[PDB]
Amino acid sequence: MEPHSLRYNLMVLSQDGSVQSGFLAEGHLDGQPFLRYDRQKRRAKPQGQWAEDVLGAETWDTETEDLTENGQDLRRTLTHIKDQKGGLHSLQEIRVCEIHEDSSTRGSRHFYYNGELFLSQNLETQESTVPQSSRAQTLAMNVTNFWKEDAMKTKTHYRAMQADCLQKLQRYLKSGVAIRRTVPPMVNVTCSEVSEGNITVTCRASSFYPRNITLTWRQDGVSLSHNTQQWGDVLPDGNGTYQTWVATRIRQGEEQRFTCYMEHSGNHGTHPVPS
């Protein structure tokens, strides 16, 4: 429905015509922050005891080594992007990892210069996408030429980049840093619009995380034709969790035949119509 992802936000800058040392960086897992680089103490640190109490130094050592390498390359591309130039200059790289359900993966790398995109790389196919802008094409052409020669891009060491956060993504999911935020949905079935030989039944799942959920009514066991029911967007219900519902109209007296089948986070549950 929505896959697992590992995102990093890297940034280098220069405030007076001199690229500042180090860099800035953020790591988010499935939408949530877990890493934050300390430019001064030169360490990758957790963004909470949550990440602090689950991840060990082995992880922070690795992320610190990796990100630092990242920072050198970025600072080097920036030096090049200006020729001397002066004043403010900024270069950010958003890199993302994705694992879907079919186990197919995705991976991208986006580069912004002074607040504007100018290059995107699909790490799974290695094709790049430059915005159809003049200034953005000049940039892309320079930065890419510069990468192939005196090569701090190097081959498909990019294909390794993809396998790298992917391995980390899998590792972090395994460590559980993301599963602790799991909240099984509160189920609640309601009978409404009681009327002319009819009565509506509504299955409401609320206060649950993550967002991926499946809900459907069943007549004696079979899923109702996708139409004969009405679903609601998966709206943010409350305080970080989500909510949604499905409904369908039935004939008064045959409540026993209907059940609401739900699936959330690998957990399948069955809910009957109220008495």
UniProtKB/Swiss-Prot annotation:
One of its GO terms (biological process) is negative regulation of defense response to virus by host. Residues 2-275 are extracellular. Glycans are attached at N142, N188, N198, N239. GO terms for cellular component: cell surface; external side of plasma membrane; extracellular space; plasma membrane. Its main location: membrane. GO terms for molecular function: natural killer cell lectin-like receptor binding. It is a single-pass type I membrane protein. Widely expressed with the exception of the central nervous system where it is absent. Expressed in many, but not all, epithelial tumors of lung, breast, kidney, ovary, prostate and colon. In hepatocellular carcinomas, expressed in tumor cells but not in surrounding non-cancerous tissue. The keyword Signal applies. Proteolytically cleaved and released from the cell surface of tumor cells. Keywords: Adaptive immunity, Cell membrane, Cytolysis, Disulfide bond, Glycoprotein, Host-virus interaction, Immunity, Immunoglobulin domain, Membrane, Signal, Transmembrane, Transmembrane helix. Changing E193K: In allele MICB*006 and allele MICB*015. It is found in: Cell membrane. Induction: By heat shock, oxidative stress, retinoic acid, IFN-alpha and the DNA methyltransferase inhibitor 5-aza-2'-deoxycytidine. Induction by IFN-alpha is impaired in patients with chronic hepatitis C virus infection. Down-regulated by human cytomegalovirus UL112 microRNA during viral infection which leads to decreased binding of KLRK1/NKG2D and reduced killing by natural killer cells. It comes from the Eukaryota. Residues 185-275 form the Ig-like C1-type domain. Disulfide bonds join C97-C165, C203-C260. It is linked to Rheumatoid arthritis: An inflammatory disease with autoimmune features and a complex genetic component. It primarily affects the joints and is characterized by inflammatory changes in the synovial membranes and articular structures, widespread fibrinoid degeneration of the collagen fibers in mesenchymal tissues, and by atrophy and rarefaction of bony structures. Genetic variation in MICB is associated with cytomegalovirus and herpes simplex virus I seropositivity and this may be associated with schizophrenia risk. Belongs to the MHC class I family. MIC subfamily. Unlike classical MHC class I molecules, does not form a heterodimer with beta-2-microglobulin. Binds as a monomer to a KLRK1/NKG2D homodimer. KLRK1 forms a complex with HCST/DAP10 in which KLRK1 binds MICB while HCST acts as an adapter molecule which enables signal transduction. Receptor-ligand interaction induces clustering of both proteins in ordered structures called immune synapses and also leads to their intercellular transfer. This is associated with a reduction in the cytotoxicity of KLRK1-expressing cells. (Microbial infection) Interacts with human cytomegalovirus/HHV-5 glycoprotein UL16; this interaction causes sequestration of MICB in the endoplasmic reticulum and increases resistance to KLRK1-mediated cytotoxicity. Widely expressed membrane-bound protein which acts as a ligand to stimulate an activating receptor KLRK1/NKG2D, expressed on the surface of essentially all human natural killer (NK), gammadelta T and CD8+ alphabeta T-cells. Up-regulated in stressed conditions, such as viral and bacterial infections or DNA damage response, serves as signal of cellular stress, and engagement of KLRK1/NKG2D by MICA triggers NK-cells resulting in a range of immune effector functions, such as cytotoxicity and cytokine production. This is MHC class I polypeptide-related sequence B. It comes from Homo sapiens (Human). The chain holds residues 24 to 297 of 383 of the full protein.
